[PDB]
Design a protein around this ligand. Structure first.
Ligand SMILES: O=C(O)CCC[C@@H]1SC[C@@H]2NC(=O)N[C@@H]21
Ligand SMILES: O=C(O)CCC[C@@H]1SC[C@@H]2NC(=O)N[C@@H]21
Ligand SMILES: O=C(O)CCC[C@@H]1SC[C@@H]2NC(=O)N[C@@H]21
Ligand SMILES: O=C(O)CCC[C@@H]1SC[C@@H]2NC(=O)N[C@@H]21
Ligand SMILES: *[C@H]1O[C@H](CO)[C@@H](O)[C@H](O)[C@H]1NC(C)=O
Ligand SMILES: *[C@H]1O[C@H](CO)[C@@H](O)[C@H](O)[C@H]1NC(C)=O
Ligand SMILES: *[C@H]1O[C@H](CO)[C@@H](O)[C@H](O)[C@H]1NC(C)=O
Ligand SMILES: *[C@H]1O[C@H](CO)[C@@H](O)[C@H](O)[C@H]1NC(C)=O
Lengths: 121, 121, 121, 121
């Protein structure tokens, strides 16, 4: 089984902690990004997500939202908890980083996309 | 002021209902999708999200995860709550739909991307 | 049949002209974007693409790259030429807008994603 | 100076060969994918792309379309040609894989997204 609970680090150097996931698949955690598109000072930020519980998969898909405390942005991450061929856990994820724009006319350029790989820290 | 609480419908015909947003920006609700890439019976699914509260914007940025109850998939949405040029509230969103694959070698094809525009019901 | 050749306009107000596609599916054209993420003056830019020729589909998928003349960026567009229910042509597309960064350490934030719908002008 | 011309291989094991880049930034080549989402026999496929020449950057931005010969799909890649911290050329790319659907009502699920890192062969 691949469990979300624990401390993780990613390819960019960001760390994240996820507490226990309840019977409904929900969990909370904290995210310390190593990088920012802003020129602001980085602060630890909370995250809230859900792990898919159908078929009690041992490598479930999951999703979570990071509510940034140092900018007006929001990032969502989705991926799957895989059991590496080495028996070690790896989170393969893709994310959408949403910036806030002041006019709906600028909405077309407000969304960045990318990946991140997490391993137990 | 653009608010997330309420009932919404999108360009594909899906409906979403979001409850009250608490002091830390949390919210939950339900999503009834009108379409599916599966060959399964669609079922109302729960969602948990967060909206950014930095600078208490009137057109907040937000994100939420939909935990599908009829499949092993997970979807994440992110976007902004705008007051459109015509005066109506509109949610401009982008999403990542993650399918579950069985081997970490099939991860590359597990993620679909799209958009949805939600309007008040 | 849905043909790529012609003059098109999109939901953002951008216009594009595509010449004739040869026996290999290749075509060239020009793109006049109505919007820019830069603060630069917009110039008409050339595009080069290819339409998929397998099974001689009447609604083929296609792809094209826009080589911007007023910035160091590149945008790729992919989609499908659909025959609307009204018998009119519509191009449903998704794009990736790539900005150039100076260090590979900033690569994670260099890519935006979005959609555009085109109709004959 | 990062150059596109040559032979490359990526993180999934696919190989690509790009020919000479002309004065207007055009180039063509061939792509042999190592994986497929189809259940078909993979076949070498042609590609046509463009690299941005504005300010004659040494780490250019670029895009290309792969016209798959064994399916009705089309893929577009975009990214930047970097000289990595260790001194090696590396292509950081993101892609959109467009499948063909039969009704414009199924357009929402036709696009997959991912990344690929190419390195010199
Ligand atoms: O840019 C900011 O300021 C905050 C967003 C940080 C972004 S979210 C996707 C990417 N992954 C990560 O670990 N850090 C960056
Ligand atoms: O395909 C499935 O089965 C479940 C996913 C439904 C997807 S999420 C993105 C898209 N938007 C929507 O309102 N419905 C579809
Ligand atoms: O930002 C710039 O300067 C040039 C890119 C323009 C972008 S590409 C995707 C989007 N569609 C469009 O018609 N215009 C914008
Ligand atoms: O799936 C198919 O059949 C053809 C698409 C191949 C895809 S394009 C993105 C991914 N990268 C790659 O090198 N091969 C796969
Ligand atoms: C977290 O990861 C390790 C854990 O100690 C640490 O060395 C590093 O400085 C931290 N990175 C961030 C972005 O906090
Ligand atoms: C949801 O929106 C309204 C509910 O009042 C209804 O007319 C419509 O059929 C519903 N659509 C779905 C997919 O449930
Ligand atoms: C192109 O579209 C129409 C065609 O005449 C025109 O009114 C409009 O000004 C043009 N838009 C751009 C961005 O060139
Ligand atoms: C391509 O890369 C090298 C060619 O020298 C070869 O070893 C490898 O097997 C090839 N891979 C594919 C998918 O063609």
């Amino acid at each position: 089984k691949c469990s979300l609970t624990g401390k993780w680090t990613n390819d960019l150097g960001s760390n994240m902690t996820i507490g226990a996931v309840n019977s409904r698949g929900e969990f909370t955690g904290t995210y310390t990004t190593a990088v920012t598109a802003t020129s602001n000072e980085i602060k630890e930020s909370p995250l809230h997500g859900t792990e898919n519980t159908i078929n009690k998969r041992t490598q479930p898909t999951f999703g979570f939202t990071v509510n940034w405390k140092f900018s007006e942005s929001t990032t969502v991450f989705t991926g799957q908890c895989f059991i590496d061929r080495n028996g070690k856990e790896v989170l393969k994820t893709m994310w959408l980083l949403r910036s806030s724009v002041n006019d709906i006319g600028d909405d077309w350029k407000a969304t960045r996309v990318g990946i991140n790989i997490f391993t137990r820290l």
